[PDB]
Write a protein that binds this DNA or RNA. Structure first.
Length: 1353
DNA sequence: CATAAAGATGAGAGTTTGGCGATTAC
RNA sequence: CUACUCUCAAGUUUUAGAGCUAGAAAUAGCAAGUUAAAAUAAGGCUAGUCCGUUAUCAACUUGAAAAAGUGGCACCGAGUCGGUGCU
DNA sequence: GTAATGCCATTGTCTCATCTTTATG
């Protein structure tokens, strides 16, 4: 008959339930297909689908880019060999061939085993002459003699293969990069800028001091020690500290009132420097620029350590020096160890298993592990100086190829490559002919805006070709259409506004965007002067004046500057108070002041004709990062300014994107008003509506415009609708599964669509509240922390946290609270629970008795507000409480609670803020409702109700339908059922509130029809729904107000307008409890083929094991190593015969074979050939069964297993624990944190104590379940033993640990768990043999329709 | 001389659950 | 708030970096250790300086595929669902 | 010879606690 569907959408589960009109879940008989003797099963229409989380595409993206990088590097090497080929053929015929075959063993190698020269003599000579490649490189850079072409290729190939990073753009040279020249330039600029009492620095050795390997502070102090005239707090000292990476404070150098901190690494240094420079002038700009340059020099100096000018290749010389120091330190270490500590020498240099030196060189031991291993050895021995200062500086026995080399720019390798090519240029003519070619190979980098160089067969590529020839680094400029490629790049990278599709989102640093957010924050500001005594919103002229005078003059505008430089200067207001914002305005016009610094034309920035130009420049600087394409895209504006500010503009870069588009902010226009969003922000009369309020408010056309355009952006298929959503792929997967669940459920119900579909979308904090308490105490001045010290761990208690939040004072009475008598003290709600269900700290106060609030059922009376307003104002301005809490505390002074407040509460409880939920409701509504009439009106047969989780949660807490997620997976289905119940109750009780929850166009009924005037005038004869603003009151039998008066509600709740019973407080709660108590809930684990990586990525050494997998076709893993541990895509049941014994007699077998992900395509191409290659004969082709992961098997006594693999199983059963034990567990574990009234808490406490034997009964229940199903008797014995060991412990702790015990019985993969301090390790099901003779159960998405196959055959 | 703030040197972790080799038992 | 481009440096793995002295070996004393090539999902055809780890997937029928179809209703109960009447 | 019972996992990231140094009253 009539029914409704409840849904609980999550990221790992989708709960679903079908309910009738009497809130009952139907139980139906379903047909069972297959070849067994079971043809029917009785199932309840309630369940939950389980599935693995959807994964994000990040890992795939990284892997893809890595593959591209490897490919392109190999192609670079192929280019180099292509240039060297013809001339190498005359010198050596099989050089490159030997290099290519370097990996093969001598047996499989067709050429000589020696790569470079082919004979052992020249190899030994080469390695002894050059023990590292940097020796050969340094020779080829510093030797004029002719060198062998093979070694030249080795150097060039090493510099090209590992070419270095590309973060620094352009040429690099010592004139603008070395520390010496930049230090001289810095002190020259310094002395030039002052010249009166200047600093003279001639004896100092800036290189030796700054480049030395020591801590930053010690280098600073050593340089100050080298300058007797300067001090650490001086200007030069603060500049050096800034250049080294410290956080210097410039207040003492200029006596500034506000602290100005500078950090070069911080992204906001430039504008901070611009503020600083604005105070002292722009003459010091180049000084700080040189400081920045000096900082870069120091970083460059950390790599360029051997920059002594003797060599021309700084890097290779530095690696040589590192080699030499390594050799010296090594020999010294061996000498010292052999002399002083003969024992354990083998452990350091021979063992290699415990991270010794042999582990550092030959084993898998990092540099930090080797240092950690040898630090106590060096500390114990004598004569270990110099090695330890090198160890602490992380420069002891370093290798030449380490993790630090990522900092090496590619200009260095380019320099060495140019040097080598120039030295051997005349000796080899083809180096003269192909110098720029090789240089281009090293320097060429594919731009971001070009992307993959495809030819139509790449899903990710977009570039356009101006020819039909192989793209090389040399002809890239004349084959790649950079213009069209950049245009396509723009079109792809521009995301569309979620509110309005088909319109590009503006950059995050767009001028119009910053104006929008600045006005959006400014419009919510209220000011009170001396006389009006009522809050007044800012007028249009006031907003424009404030913006122009403050926001267009300073990057940061604070409330003090606002009252001092506007209200006092223009409005002549001495004292002003502002509530809208806190310390300062979060929004700012950063881009405005940036462009003002660039072009120095304030009037040009305010011309409304130049808006599009500036927006285009900002868009260009946001989209691109390459200097050349920026130069190309800024040539049109060359006539506006040129050669200074254009250059400075090209160096400026912006990053980020906004959420709104231009057409939304200043495009679409209200038909009646004729004002855009920004126009409404600037001027809106008395009341000022913010952006979110204009979208919400139905009196304007903006909501209609956003709604009518929503269906234009979307597509026709379900996949496109889900792909367009704004969420993680996991919740999108859950949404698709939800849609399919709905489809299957309406199929099960004879293709009858439901009436309703209810949808629910399923240490730092302690530190923040602790800091809040400390800041409030420091601001106030009451040293409660001195007399009563507390830590962040103890502050989780509600009454103690409120005690410290309220300055250790009673909120209603002028007396101090007793620190050690909080149990006698009560926690009161500022706004009663009868009006709004808010149990947060934002709406709670602590007092000795809640009778001091007075006799009213509203906010606390005026007699207390008038007395405590001063103390509440001190707690307000001290950030002890928030603005909303102060507003609620002082509501009686402004009449008390009002109709607007109650409507705000209703909207807070009933409306869903999450956009994804509205889009899911839209998808289900579009799929369910598709009929029309004669007119162009949509017939809405199915109502899609959107509920908040708080409603169902409070429903559980109020009527003891407690949720314990750790027991089983039934709670998803139960949540779905309760969602259905609450949704149907609300739609039956309040039809006029359909527009709040039900999706679609609906009436706009306001507060007048709903909110009643008074308690006695409930209004049953006038349609008024409720006097008390809490929507969930009709479920309750009694309503306890804040005074203690117990209001009574009828036993049967009925709708006022239609006279339909909506809730029977006896029969319906009994029905709900019975439904939650049902043990047969359809839990289905979505069977999924496994995809992704073939195996573990580890490349293991060679081994005599057939589990190893070849890394290349002809790389036999017994000789070469490879991978192991492949992932099984799915398992395959094979019934065939295998050869047994010497005589190879054919024996019939039935077994599971794991088809790995790598094997999948080959197996599916021809299964029989694959199986015969595996050894199977006479395979029964028609009996092959594909068994993906989580395939379900039943064996005996209802015991179930899920397939994890071809050789392993998971638990397949659910423990249907009775409701009374679930509620007992919830209550026992929530002993101290009940968070309820004292009487209620006492009832729960006495229930726990009177029912403490449920602990033993739950243990018994787990035991019998495990013996029937789990069959892990070692762990069960462990559990029972531990439980007997800890029967003395408190009830709460035993409850908490039984909660941990339910992982033994949970559905899915076995997992380890802890009972108190005893760890119980997982018992695995390491054989799939038994399920080859069990019943396989193929399940529908809902688990209702099934087919059972008896694999005995 | 005492208290508060910032930076540096080690501390662990950074899921889960399937594969594989050693181990143990019949 | 997902998706995307370009790119670096390590790691790991086989070979090249001859090991020297005794001893029938087993095993002992020492000398050196820092680097390089190649691969970095097997591979694929569309042969690109492209693609290969995301999404998607119970069973059965028809199809190469996108995709269409296939499973009676009440009542009394509730240990993973059972029983009875109707049809 | 066959069937049932601890370690490892490609990454360049985190955050917390204690000690030392500098600044202010």
């Amino acid at each position: 008959k009539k029914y409704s569907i409840g849904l609980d959408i999550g990221t790992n589960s989708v709960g679903w339930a079908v309910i009738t009109d009497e809130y009952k879940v139907p139980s139906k008989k379903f047909k069972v297909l297959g070849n067994t003797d079971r043809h029917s099963i009785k199932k309840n229409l309630i369940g939950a689908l389980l599935f693995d989380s959807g994964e994000t595409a990040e890992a795939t993206r990284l892997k893809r880019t890595a593959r591209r990088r490897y490919t392109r590097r190999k192609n670079r090497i192929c280019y180099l060999q292509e240039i060297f080929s013809n001339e190498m053929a005359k010198v050596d015929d099989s050089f490159f061939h030997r290099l290519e075959e370097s990996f093969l063993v001598e047996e499989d190698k067709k050429h000589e085993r020696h790569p470079i020269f082919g004979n052992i003599v020249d190899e030994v000579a080469y390695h002894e002459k050059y023990p590292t490649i940097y020796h050969l490189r340094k020779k080829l850079v510093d030797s004029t003699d002719k060198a062998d072409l093979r070694l030249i290729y080795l150097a060039l190939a090493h510099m090209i293969k590992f070419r270095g990073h590309f973060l620094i753009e352009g040429d690099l040279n010592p004139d603008n990069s070395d520390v010496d020249k930049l230090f001289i330039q810095l002190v020259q600029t310094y002395n030039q800028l002052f010249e009166e009492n200047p600093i003279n620095a001639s004896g100092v050795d800036a290189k030796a001091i700054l480049s030395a390997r020591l801590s930053k502070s010690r280098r600073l102090e050593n340089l100050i020690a080298q300058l007797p005239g300067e001090k650490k707090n001086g200007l030069f000292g603060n500049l050096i500290a800034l250049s080294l990476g410290l956080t210097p404070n410039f207040k003492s150098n200029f006596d500034l009132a506000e602290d100005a901190k500078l950090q070069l690494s911080k992204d906001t240094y430039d504008d901070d420097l611009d503020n600083l420079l604005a105070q002292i002038g722009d003459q010091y700009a180049d000084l700080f620029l040189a400081a920045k340059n000096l900082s870069d020099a120091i970083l460059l100096s950390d790599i360029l350590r051997v920059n002594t000018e003797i060599t021309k290749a700084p890097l290779s010389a530095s690696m040589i020096k590192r080699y030499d120091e390594h050799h010296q330190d090594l020999t010294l270490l061996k000498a010292l160890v052999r002399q002083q500590l003969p024992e354990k020498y083998k452990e350091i240099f021979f063992d290699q298993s415990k991270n010794g030196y042999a582990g550092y060189i030959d084993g898998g031991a990092s540099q930090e592990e080797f240092y950690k291993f040898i630090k106590p050895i060096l500390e114990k021995m004598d004569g270990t100086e110099e090695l330890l200062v090198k160890l602490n500086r992380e420069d002891l026995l370093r290798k030449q190829r380490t993790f630090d080399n990522g900092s090496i720019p590619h200009q260095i390798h380019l320099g060495e490559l140019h040097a080598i090519l120039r030295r051997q240029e005349d000796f080899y003519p083809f180096l003269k002919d192909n110098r720029e070619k090789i240089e281009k190979i090293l320097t060429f980098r594919i731009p971001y805006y070009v992307g993959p160089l495809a030819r139509g067969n790449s899903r990710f590529a977009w570039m356009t070709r101006k020819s039909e020839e192989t793209i090389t680094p040399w002809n890239f400029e004349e084959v790649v259409d950079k213009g069209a490629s950049a245009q396509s790049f723009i079109e792809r990278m521009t995301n569309f506004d979620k509110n309005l599709p088909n319109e590009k989102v503006l950059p995050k640093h767009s001028l119009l965007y910053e104006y929008f957010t600045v006005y959006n924050e400014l419009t919510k500001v209220k000011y009170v002067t001396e006389g009006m005594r009522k809050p007044a919103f800012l007028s249009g002229e006031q907003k424009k004046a404030i913006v122009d005078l403050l926001f267009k003059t300073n990057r940061k505008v604070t409330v003090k500057q606002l009252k001092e430089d506007y209200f006092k200067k223009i409005e002549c207001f001495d004292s002003v108070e502002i509530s809208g914002v806190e310390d300062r305005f979060n929004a700012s016009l950063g881009t405005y002041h940036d462009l003002l610094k660039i072009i120095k034309d304030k009037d040009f920035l305010d011309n409304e004709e130049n808006e599009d130009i500036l927006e285009d420049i900002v868009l260009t600087l946001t989209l691109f990062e390459d200097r050349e394409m920026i130069e190309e895209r800024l040539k049109t504006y060359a006539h506006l300014f040129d050669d200074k500010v254009m250059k400075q503009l090209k160096r400026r870069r912006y990053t980020g994107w906004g959420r709104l588009s231009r057409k939304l902010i200043n495009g679409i226009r209200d038909k009646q008003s004729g004002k855009t969003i920004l126009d409404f922000l600037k001027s809106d009369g008395f009341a000022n509506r913010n952006f979110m309020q204009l979208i919400h408010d139905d009196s304007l056309t903006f909501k209609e415009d956003i709604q009518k355009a929503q269906v234009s952006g979307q597509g026709d298929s379900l996949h496109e609708h889900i792909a367009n959503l704004a969420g993680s792929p996991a919740i999108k997967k859950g949404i698709l599964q939800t849609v399919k669940v709905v489809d299957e459920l309406v199929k099960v119900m004879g293709r009858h669509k439901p009436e309703n579909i209810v949808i629910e979308m399923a240490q730092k904090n302690s530190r923040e509240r602790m800091k809040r308490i400390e800041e409030g105490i420091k601001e106030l001045g009451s040293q409660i922390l001195k007399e009563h010290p507390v830590e962040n761990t103890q502050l989780q208690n509600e009454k103690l946290y409120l005690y410290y939040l309220q300055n250790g004072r009673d909120m209603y009475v002028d007396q101090e609270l007793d620190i050690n008598r909080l149990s006698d003290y009560d926690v009161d709600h500022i706004v009663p629970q009868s009006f709004l269900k808010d149990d947060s700290i934002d709406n709670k106060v602590l007092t000795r008795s809640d009778k001091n609030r007075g006799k009213s059922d509203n906010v606390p009376s005026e007699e207390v507000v008038k007395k405590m307003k001063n103390y509440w104002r001190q707690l307000l301005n001290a950030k002890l409480i928030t603005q909303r809490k102060f507003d609620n505390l002082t509501k009686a002074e402004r009449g008390g609670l009002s109709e607007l407040d109650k409507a705000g509460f209703i909207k807070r409880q009933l409306v869903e803020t999450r956009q994804i939920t509205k889009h899911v409701a839209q998808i289900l509504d579009s799929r369910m409702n598709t009929k029309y009439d004669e007119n162009d009106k949509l017939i809405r047969e199915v109502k899609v109700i959107t509920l908040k989780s708080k409603l169902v949660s409070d429903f559980r807490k109020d009527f003891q339908f407690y949720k314990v997620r750790e027991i089983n997976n039934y709670h998803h289905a139960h949540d779905a059922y309760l969602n259905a119940v609450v949704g149907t109750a609300l739609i039956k009780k309040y039809p006029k509130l359909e527009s709040e929850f039900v999706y679609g166009d609906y009436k706009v009924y306001d507060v007048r029809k709903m909110i009643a005037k008074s308690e006695q005038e409930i209004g049953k004869a006038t349609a008024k729904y409720f006097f008390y603003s809490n929507i969930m009151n009709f479920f309750k039998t009694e309503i306890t107000l804040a005074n203690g008066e117990i209001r009574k509600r009828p036993l049967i709740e009925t709708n006022g307008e239609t006279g339909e019973i909506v809730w029977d407080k006896g029969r319906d709660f009994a029905t709900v409890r019975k439904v939650l108590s049902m043990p047969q809930v359809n839990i289905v684990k979505k069977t999924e083929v496994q995809t992704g990586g073939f195996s573990k990525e580890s490349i293991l050494p060679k081994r005599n094991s057939d589990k190893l997998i070849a890394r290349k076709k002809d790389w036999d893993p017994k000789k070469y190593g490879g991978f192991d541990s492949p992932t099984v895509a799915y398992s395959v049941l094979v019934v065939a015969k295998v050869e047994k014994g010497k005589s190879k007699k054919l024996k019939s077998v039935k077994e599971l074979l794991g088809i790995t992900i790598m094997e999948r395509s080959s197996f599916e191409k021809n299964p029989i050939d694959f199986l015969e290659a595996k050894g199977y004969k006479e395979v029964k082709k028609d009996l092959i069964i594909k068994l993906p992961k989580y395939s379900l098997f039943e064996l005996e006594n209802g015991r179930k297993r899920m397939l994890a693999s071809a050789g392993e199983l998971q638990k397949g059963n659910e423990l249907a624990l009775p409701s009374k034990y679930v509620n007992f567990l919830y209550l026992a574990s929530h002993y101290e944190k009940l968070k309820g009234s004292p009487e209620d808490n006492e009832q729960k406490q006495l229930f726990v104590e009177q029912h403490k034997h449920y602990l033993d009964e739950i243990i018994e229940q787990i035991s019998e379940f495990s013996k029937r199903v789990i069959l892990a008797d070692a762990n069960l014995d462990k559990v029972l033993s531990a439980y007997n060991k800890h029967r003395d412990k408190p009830i709460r702790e035993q409850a908490e640990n039984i909660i941990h015990l339910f992982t033994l019985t949970n559905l899915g993969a076995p997992a380890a768990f802890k009972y108190f301090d005893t760890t119980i390790d997982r018992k695995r099901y390491c054989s799939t043999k038994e399920v080859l003779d069990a019943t396989l159960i193929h399940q529908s998405i809902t688990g209702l329709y099934e087919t059972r196959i008896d694999l005995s055959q």
